[PDB]
Design a protein around this ligand. Structure first.
Ligand SMILES: [Mg+2]
Ligand SMILES: [Mg+2]
Ligand SMILES: [Mg+2]
Ligand SMILES: [Mg+2]
Ligand SMILES: [Mg+2]
Ligand SMILES: [Mg+2]
Ligand SMILES: [Mg+2]
Ligand SMILES: [Mg+2]
Ligand SMILES: [Mg+2]
Ligand SMILES: [Mg+2]
Ligand SMILES: [Mg+2]
Ligand SMILES: [Mg+2]
Ligand SMILES: [Mg+2]
Ligand SMILES: [Mg+2]
Ligand SMILES: [Mg+2]
Ligand SMILES: [Mg+2]
Ligand SMILES: [Mg+2]
Ligand SMILES: [Mg+2]
Ligand SMILES: [Mg+2]
Ligand SMILES: [Mg+2]
Ligand SMILES: [Mg+2]
Ligand SMILES: [Mg+2]
Ligand SMILES: [Mg+2]
Ligand SMILES: [Mg+2]
Lengths: 75, 113, 133, 60
RNA sequence: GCGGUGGAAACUACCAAGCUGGAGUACGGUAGGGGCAGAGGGAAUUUCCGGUGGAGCGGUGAAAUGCGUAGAGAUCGGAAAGAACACCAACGGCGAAAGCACUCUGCUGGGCCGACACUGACACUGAGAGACGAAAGCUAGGGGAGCGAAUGGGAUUAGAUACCCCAGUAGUCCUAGCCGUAAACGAUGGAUACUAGGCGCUGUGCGUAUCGACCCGUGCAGUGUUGUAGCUAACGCGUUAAGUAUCCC
């Protein structure tokens, strides 16, 4: 289905699992074990994005405008 | 065969006071079957084994204020498929009743050894 | 595998110190050429290539134990020089020579890989890959 | 030699009472010669049964 | 050494396209005291209310303080409260570390394994910076059985501001925060590659054994004990290196 390994699909799966995790992190604030994972996965997504910005400028801008991902920290 | 579509499998044991009749027992039966089915249970399968002496004496206070000391007990066994969301009230709803002296519920996992 | 050259070298050094004649190494233009050269200098018995799952392996036969394994007068040394951290180059008049010439120095130059001998004949300098005793 | 061919639970009392001491203590894995997985499952079972008063903590 | 010009193109760098074995994604499995939250459980202890009973209990190297005829302890029957979870438990399990174990349910973090299903170097490390971080401690509100700094009595002693005994407040517990230190120890930063074995365990996978439990041999992933090469000032370390090399702090 599409490419399940494609950059943009992966970044999506990540952004989505993160915004999902957000609710759990809001309800139970004392769970640090889970937050540590969040920070890890966010790291992954951020990496892929940096990579994709290097490789293709167009696909990148399209993607972060599409998935409502916050603009990059290289500015 | 049993096949849940987006549900969790469950077993529940309930222990009731020995002083009960079969009509009061079936009324409880009916009641809890209805709570389950009202909670989205597809397949309520109930089974009964009543009146066994307990390992140990248990005490239950009533709403009438009675201290009831038991020896025997009524074991009700429930296989049912409910959403993980809806198992929440059931357990307390079992605790709250004066007729239910000891309740416990288990999730069932497939055995692979 | 930050450095590939160093790694080949190491697999040799290790298999050597443990008295085994046979080594598996992973091939590459560099690897292959270096091993060729190693053969024409004569530090190693025989080379050959293998392939599986799109992987290439040069197996190296190695010079037999010295008149037993316990009593070894000689080992076969190897040393990385230009390495990712610091790359060493040399002109024609600084070209290294090893133990008065008993050992050999490998150079990558404009004309390809060679020993110091070749570099002196042709008058070329370049990047010094490693030394061999 | 000895083995579990039947699903072990808290309601197979025959089973669990094999692996229980006279005093109702749980016997160790080294004694019962069970795989670690088994032993754990037994243990939790015994505790659950103990709560449901199917088997006693202490004796009479 | 700097500057101009003419050549070479291996290696670093650049530019264009490719490739999976590195790193990930999906898919399917499976073990687990991972974490947060919510239910439920029983011993034991302490106090209180009774019945019995009627001189000592309790404690120490030996004593005494103490508790007791206003009925102690002992024993049976009641309630009530808090805290900790016997056996399992193991030279076992998960966790980044701190740590995590009566039971259960729910929300969720990782791990590992087998398949090409996919992307195609997306890697490793990390100055600054951020999060977590035993116990003691602190602010605010609760809670207060046991234990117990401080404190007091009793001893012991030349003395005893100690060790022992009798009491006993903070604190230990919960909620919301601060503090950021420990022999926070493997006294061993991280990643990758590569180099005998023997005996063990945990997870899975394969073939065999039966056609389901073993069983065997094996493939991985981690974990434990001896030990060869090699290393080391010795002790020792030894595929989980303190070995042979590369990179960053
Ligand atoms: Mg120069
Ligand atoms: Mg010049
Ligand atoms: Mg070229
Ligand atoms: Mg490229
Ligand atoms: Mg009780
Ligand atoms: Mg008394
Ligand atoms: Mg571990
Ligand atoms: Mg999980
Ligand atoms: Mg492609
Ligand atoms: Mg720092
Ligand atoms: Mg903090
Ligand atoms: Mg504290
Ligand atoms: Mg103070
Ligand atoms: Mg005390
Ligand atoms: Mg004093
Ligand atoms: Mg006290
Ligand atoms: Mg706090
Ligand atoms: Mg320090
Ligand atoms: Mg230190
Ligand atoms: Mg066996
Ligand atoms: Mg291993
Ligand atoms: Mg050791
Ligand atoms: Mg050793
Ligand atoms: Mg050292």
């Amino acid at each position: 289905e599409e490419n399940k390994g494609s950059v943009e699909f992966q970044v999506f799966c990540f952004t989505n699992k993160i915004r999902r995790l957000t609710l759990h992190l809001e309800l139970h604030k004392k769970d640090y074990s889970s937050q540590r994972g969040l920070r890890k996965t966010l790291g992954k997504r951020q990496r892929l994005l940096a990579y994709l910005l290097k490789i293709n400028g167009v696909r990148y801008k399209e993607l972060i405008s599409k998935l409502n991902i916050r603009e990059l920290k290289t500015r | 065969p049993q096949c849940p579509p987006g549900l969790r499998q469950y077993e529940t044991m309930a222990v009731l006071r020995p002083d009960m009749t079969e009509d009061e027992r079936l009324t409880l039966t009916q009641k809890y079957e209805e709570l389950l089915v009202a909670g989205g249970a597809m397949y309520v399968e109930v089974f009964n084994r009543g009146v066994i002496p307990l390992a140990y004496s248990i005490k239950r206070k009533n709403k009438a204020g009675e201290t009831n000391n038991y020896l025997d007990g009524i074991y009700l066994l429930f296989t049912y498929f409910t959403k993980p969301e809806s198992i929440s009230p059931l357990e307390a709803a079992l605790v709250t009743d004066d007729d239910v002296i000891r309740s416990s519920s288990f999730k069932i996992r497939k055995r692979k050894y | 595998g930050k450095d590939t050259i160093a790694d080949i070298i190491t697999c040799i050094r290790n298999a050597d110190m443990n008295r085994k004649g046979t080594v598996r190494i992973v091939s590459t233009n560099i690897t292959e050429n270096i091993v060729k050269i190693l053969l024409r200098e004569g530090f190693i018995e025989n080379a050959r290539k293998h392939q599986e799952r799109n992987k290439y392996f040069l197996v190296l036969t190695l010079r037999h134990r010295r008149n037993k394994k316990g009593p070894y007068l000689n080992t076969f040394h190897l040393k990385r020089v230009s390495r990712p951290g610091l790359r060493i180059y040399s002109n024609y008049q600084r070209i290294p020579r090893i133990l008065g010439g008993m050992g050999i120095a490998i150079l990558s130059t404009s004309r390809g890989i060679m020993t110091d001998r070749e570099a002196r004949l042709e008058g070329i300098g370049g990047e010094i890959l490693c030394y061999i005793w | 030699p000895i083995q579990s061919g039947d699903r072990i639970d808290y309601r197979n009392m025959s089973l669990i009472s094999r692996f229980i001491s006279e005093q109702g203590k749980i016997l160790s894995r080294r004694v019962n010669r069970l795989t670690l997985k088994q032993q754990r499952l037994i243990t939790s079972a015994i505790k659950q049964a103990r709560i449901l008063s199917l088997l006693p903590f202490l004796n009479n």
